[PDB]
């Protein structure tokens, strides 16, 4: 009686997300990996959410990341998310991929999107040899995903390579003059969707900001109609996994609501776990409202760890001295700001 109004529900949740993915249904692993892109995966990351490789399709590297949805087994400790749960970041993931060919915002700061597709089958044996290797040279903390039945759903999503994340760079930064950078390209892509889609990141943790070589001597953004630079210092940043974030699509609100979650909200060990904290406290665990804050805090937690965790292979010089003296500086008054693109448009750093 709530059986057929809940099923019929499902169902729905079921029919969005094909086709967010323009599908009629689920399609086998082979249809997103055939043998030969299959055949080049290797590992690269993880998280509670699942697996992320790396492959190539059509002679480009790709990240592959996918996702058990729907089905009963917990999976690294967490249960899987539903049809709905998972839309966002699908709905999302698209979304700001579409910034970087679009004319009055504009930034190539996000990660680009080839396609996402909710994928029906156990785990591609040769992904699982994939996950083997990492789990023996890096270490997993995740479960070895060979208990999800042919019936299990996914979702894949194949996004371009962005190269290799903050964290993992924590040592191969040069110098504070690429800190300063990175934090320019982080600013400026928030800024862009803020102005574009009224977006916020929400979890935006140094995992979540990769940094590829660059020949560029000048990356350019157009923030509401103005195209400016930042030069790159040979990095690109990209901003990914929009699992936690908010926009909006035409005037429709899209977002991960948390006003129920408790553990995002009682993390400690870093100062990743104050942002949820600041969050929930500054939005009143209202997740749907806009607040582009959200971002400058995010943005504060980034400047933080480039400050105290970056060791660079270059002080130094006089030079990097005094802009060690502005990230300083920008740390200790960007939160007087209200969102990236008040800082942005109107902070001393990025003049």
Not at 77 to 93: A, D, M, N, V
Not at 222 to 246: A, E, F, H, W
Not at 254 to 281: A, H, N, P, W
């Amino acid at each position: 009686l709530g059986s057929i109004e809940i099923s019929n529900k499902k169902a729905s949740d079921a029919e969005k997300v094909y086709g967010e993915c323009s599908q009629k249904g689920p399609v086998p692993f082979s249809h997103c990996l055939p043998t030969e892109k299959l055949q080049r995966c290797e590992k690269i990351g993880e998280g509670v959410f699942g697996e992320v490789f790396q492959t190539i399709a059509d002679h480009t590297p790709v990240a592959i990341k996918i996702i058990a949805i729907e089905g009963p087994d917990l999976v690294n400790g967490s249960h899987q998310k539903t049809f709905e749960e998972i839309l966002p970041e699908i709905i999302i993931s698209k979304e700001l991929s579409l910034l970087s060919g679009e004319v009055c915002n504009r930034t190539e700061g996000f990660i680009g999107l080839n396609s996402v597709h909710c994928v029906q089958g156990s785990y591609p044996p040769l992904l699982l040899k994939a996950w083997d290797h990492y789990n023996s040279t890096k270490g997993s903390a995740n479960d070895r995903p060979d208990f999800f039945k042919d019936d299990q759903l996914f979702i894949v999503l194949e996004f371009e390579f962005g190269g290799i994340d903050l964290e993992q760079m924590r040592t191969k930064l040069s110098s504070l003059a690429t800190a300063k950078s990175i934090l320019h390209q982080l600013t400026a892509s928030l800024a862009v969707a803020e102005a574009s889609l009224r977006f916020e990141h929400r979890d935006l943790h140094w995992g979540n900001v990769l940094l590829k070589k660059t020949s560029l001597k000048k990356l350019h953004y157009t923030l509401n109609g103005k195209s400016s630079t930042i030069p790159s210092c040979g990095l690109q940043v990209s901003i990914i996994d929009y699992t936690l974030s908010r926009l909006e699509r035409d005037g429709i609100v899209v977002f991960c609501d948390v006003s129920m979650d408790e553990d995002l909200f009682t993390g400690d060990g870093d100062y990743q776990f104050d942002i949820y904290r600041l969050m929930k406290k500054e939005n009143n665990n209202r997740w749907g409202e806009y607040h582009p804050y959200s971002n400058v805090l995010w943005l504060h937690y980034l400047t933080d760890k480039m400050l105290k965790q970056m060791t660079f292979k270059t002080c130094n010089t006089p030079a990097m001295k005094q802009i060690k003296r502005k990230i300083q500086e920008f740390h200790r008054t960007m939160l007087n700001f209200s969102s990236a693109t008040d800082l942005l448009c109107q902070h001393s750093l990025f003049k």
